[PDB]
Symmetry: C3
Subunit: 328 residues, 3 copies
Amino acid sequence: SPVFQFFDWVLRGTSQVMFVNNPLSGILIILGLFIQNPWWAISGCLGTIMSTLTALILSQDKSAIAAGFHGYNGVLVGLLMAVFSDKGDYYWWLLLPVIIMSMSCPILSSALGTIFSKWDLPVFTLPFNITVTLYLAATGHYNLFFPTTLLQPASAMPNITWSEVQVPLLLRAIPVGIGQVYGCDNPWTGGIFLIALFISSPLICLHAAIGSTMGMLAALTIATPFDSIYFGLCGFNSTLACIAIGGMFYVITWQTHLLAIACALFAAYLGAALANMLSVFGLPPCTWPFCLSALTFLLLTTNNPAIYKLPLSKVTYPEANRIYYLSQ
Amino acid sequence: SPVFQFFDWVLRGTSQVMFVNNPLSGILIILGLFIQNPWWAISGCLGTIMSTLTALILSQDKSAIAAGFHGYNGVLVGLLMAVFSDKGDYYWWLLLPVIIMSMSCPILSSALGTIFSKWDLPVFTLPFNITVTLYLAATGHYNLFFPTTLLQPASAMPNITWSEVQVPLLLRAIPVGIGQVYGCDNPWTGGIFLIALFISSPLICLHAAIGSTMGMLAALTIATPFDSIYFGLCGFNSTLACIAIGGMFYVITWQTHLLAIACALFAAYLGAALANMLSVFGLPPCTWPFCLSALTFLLLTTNNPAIYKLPLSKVTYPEANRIYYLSQ
Amino acid sequence: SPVFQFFDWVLRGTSQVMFVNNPLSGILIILGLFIQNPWWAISGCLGTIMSTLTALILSQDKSAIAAGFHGYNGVLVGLLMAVFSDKGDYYWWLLLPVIIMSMSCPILSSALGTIFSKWDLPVFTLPFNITVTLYLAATGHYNLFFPTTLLQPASAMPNITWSEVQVPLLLRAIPVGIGQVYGCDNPWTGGIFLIALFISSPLICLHAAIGSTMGMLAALTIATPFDSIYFGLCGFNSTLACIAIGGMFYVITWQTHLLAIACALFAAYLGAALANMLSVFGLPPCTWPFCLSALTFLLLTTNNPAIYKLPLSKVTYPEANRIYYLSQ
């Protein structure tokens, strides 16, 4: 039936943000981001629905819509306009942009995939980055209709007291850093997202955990204030980068594992850089470090046979990737 | 004769900003932008002349110079350095940059057309965007020689009173929005530009009008202050985008018409975004939304046979485009 | 022996910033940038060593490592994090970023060279630009560990008194402008760099000198404060651009010489633009004008047989380039 098929597609899109396609994973992600905030859940689901509908009415590929490729850029757009909204919870007018902006996610996801299909790169999260970045710039904090939260560049040195670092909270920055991948800051939401990852592929779960760890460690190395680390804002780019490079696209080996750790570190440092830069505009580093770091590590060409990049046409969860590559 | 041929080329370049090649259209555009301000007219004509001369002395293609492709990026550069000049009218020293910057328009119009000819995209207005953006950044408002007008990021919520919206002025935002492509804010100038468009191809005129309408409507939807709408600053990117997508490059159908309306809306929202972003640097959104939106809609690939993208080698006014496509 | 071969590679990398491969040139550059500041010398040498080691352990091409292609992006990264460091000389902890950031130079130098090898363009200094730009954004002036110098956008008109211009200092802006490629402001360092260039190829030395001259002249034309000109900050992009376009990649003719002068002027104006832009973020224009201008002049396509672009696989010092081209 068309309705159940479409809802399967939107569930797969919800799960696809973290490289997993299973529908049960989508249900778990949706449940977690309902646990965090039901308003963000409604906005993100509306974004996914409208993005998939646009991909349908734009005659996009049906084998890519059915895999959630055209819906994972809508859930994030909805969620992150429900996050950066100063108007508070249940500002229903905000759903009107959530539709319109989501409708532009497929177009970008097509256009950039005509610039990137020549080098066989995925359009990781760039539709979301472009769309929500232009939304938050167009509206801004000083807007009558859809004001956004005020992000302001640092104007003084942080007062970091290293004797008060909460190591339990520092460890909990891992689940929340994975939770923050959807913009959710609730450790239960991060744990449910991690269960959703583990159900599909354990390698993705492990790489997300170590990506959060690398992000928090990088934030510690560059003297990031502890509140941002505890909140999980320093990890989600690293989690996604570690998932993407380590196993999903590169076949999983120890050399690819080290490359994924390096990509997580590069994505964390670039996340700090882009947070400090875009804070001048009042913008967040919404998955930009991920796109830049994952693309600069996928474009990497090495004479090492162990670092092998799979064709996008034959990419699946890392275990199936390695089985396919060993079968050749 | 070389002189009359060169003046025909500069007239075609003046007209080509709005996708029209006729020389009579160029004369009408020049007359309109003399009606607005003769100083801007002199600067823009100097820019066109110097850009075409540079394209001649750089051994550029003579079938593209003769079509005004190397002159439409000089008229805008001259006009928009005569617009963003705090020194006032008839500051003759300003002509010295107007030459130099214009001389860099062909080079970009070649260089970018080596990066874009692989995907068969036109270098829409990027020479102008890069050149005048680096000019206004290099000089800035605080410069002894060629100071520019002060564009400053918003620091408080607008005091918009919706009972005082002047619907006649809101409608007049369409002709002035069309005339603002060249920087002119005079409704008579916009009307003359619209006559110039209509003489060549009625579809371009209709798409420019509905592009201005979409720009003003988008500005209303995102609570843009009414002065900017009345001035026509919220439409010109939308007008150009609607001209480009709807008929000029995509063959004209109802699906392409809807896509052109969507591109106008996307260009308006991206224009607000880029105005809010570049205002930090003190820069205007000088045709950047057009380039980004038109390129992201031309790169769009759909399985719909009605949305057909013509090769650039066989692109002309939309009526001839459709006749050629139906003849196949 | 591996040790002497590796040190030869790092010397060639040190020299390769200015397009010269000789090891004696590398020794002279290192001596000059020890004369300027030994701390910057230590940081830059550490950057070169770590970048070459990373290129070795990433299975990069050994015919490119042996030519210093993977080391010239590390010397600059080390030098320019030792320059933009508010902590003062001999802050040994700064060596820890100098390693990590340098290790990311090869990856970019590979990734961008997969995007640019399709148009046969070199990755000029983009690894350095991206890496140090994200370092200086991530840390910034307000950082507890590795604070950077405060670059702040202009907030008032300069008080330039044209009767006090020191023409001897204005001329000395040429050697110091050449020496500022590596960050050194000492005229003796610039002279030693110029000797190092002249030993390898006189055309590179001449083009560097006239590039500094074009940079200082452009700075004079756009009313740049005299302190920046004397310091040599307005020339190094122009010197490098004149070296690259005039002889190194384009075969050396009078038309290519004029094109190199034009590229130096464009790089100087773009350097002012990018200094004014990136100063909002607190960032310097660290070789960005060079990459943008050299790439937009290499992508230039002309019907002039004298303006000929050599394949990167057969590029050497300009004299050998012309001999090869005449031999055909």
